[PDB]
């Protein structure tokens, strides 16, 4: 009788994995996006005798760090990181989140931002002059030129902070900013150090990394597994219903 529960649990976890894949497909154009992996884990139950039940629970190990392509928009202050670059921004609660979304905006008071989160460079949240044109170097230096002034008045005003993360030690957060895991945080310190080995380029913006072929194959496999589990449910129910007639007299 309990064989129905493992099948229904498998069907429910397949539905959850389908939801994850659909969420991955939905944001196929958000700049600086990391796809969500998914996998099924077997969870056997150890009873007394004849261990014949092994459930399944869907799980997501984490984002895969394969960089996507980058569109050349020629915008002066659009940056794209290297293979494992990470722009460090300040989240809502003061934690330092890491992103690859290079679309940097400027507020009225010269404050830099990314989707409302102030990007922090060498020091604190960097603020450029009021209405000056901004240029990003090949390694994170920020140059400002006040409009109307002669071109020989361009001056450095700050420097970005770029950290290098391997990818297997970073976990996503609820808001969507990757942070170090507990062990990696303990090993490398609470806050990372701005390594000088990372180089970036301006004028390009990196897209998302979602594989349509992987998405399609996952969807097909999920649908087929769901159908098989439903057939198992039907068979078990029919057998139990016909077996209960034995209880009569």
């Amino acid at each position: 009788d309990h064989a129905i529960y493992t099948a229904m649990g498998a069907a429910s976890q397949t539905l959850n994995q389908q939801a994850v894949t659909a969420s991955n497909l939905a944001n196929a154009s958000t700049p600086g996006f990391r796809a969500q992996l998914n996998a099924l884990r077997a969870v056997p139950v150890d009873g007394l005798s004849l261990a014949t039940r092994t459930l399944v629970t869907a799980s997501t190990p984490g984002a895969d760090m394969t960089p996507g392509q980058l569109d050349y928009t020629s915008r002066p202050l659009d940056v794209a990181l290297q293979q494992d670059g990470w722009l460090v921004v300040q989240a809502a609660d003061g934690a330092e989140g890491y992103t690859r979304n290079g679309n940097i905006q400027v507020g009225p008071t010269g404050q830099l931002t990314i989707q409302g989160h102030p990007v922090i460079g060498e020091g604190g949240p960097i603020t450029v002059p009021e209405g000056s044109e901004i240029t990003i170097a090949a390694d994170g230096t920020i140059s400002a030129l006040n409009p109307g002034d002669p071109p020989n008045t361009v001056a450095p005003v700050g420097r970005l902070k770029l950290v290098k993360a391997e990818g297997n030690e970073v976990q996503r957060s609820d808001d969507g900013l990757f942070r170090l895991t507990a062990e990696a945080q303990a090993e490398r310190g609470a806050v990372l150090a701005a390594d000088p080995s990372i180089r970036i380029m301006s004028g390009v913006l990196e897209g998302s990394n979602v594989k349509p072929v992987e998405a399609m194959t996952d969807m097909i496999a999920n649908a087929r597994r769901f159908e098989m589990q439903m057939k198992v449910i039907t068979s078990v129910d029919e057998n139990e219903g016909r077996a209960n007639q034995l209880l009569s007299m």
């Binding site: 884990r41 969870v43 056997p44 139950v45 150890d46 009873g47 007394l48």
Partner: peptide, 21 residues
């Protein structure tokens, strides 16, 4: 012993650990 037989003390609790510590 054999399943379906009778025994003096109850079965141990059953657990399904997602990941072994």
């Amino acid at each position: 012993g054999v399943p379906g037989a009778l025994s003096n003390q109850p079965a141990p609790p059953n657990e399904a650990p997602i990941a072994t510590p």
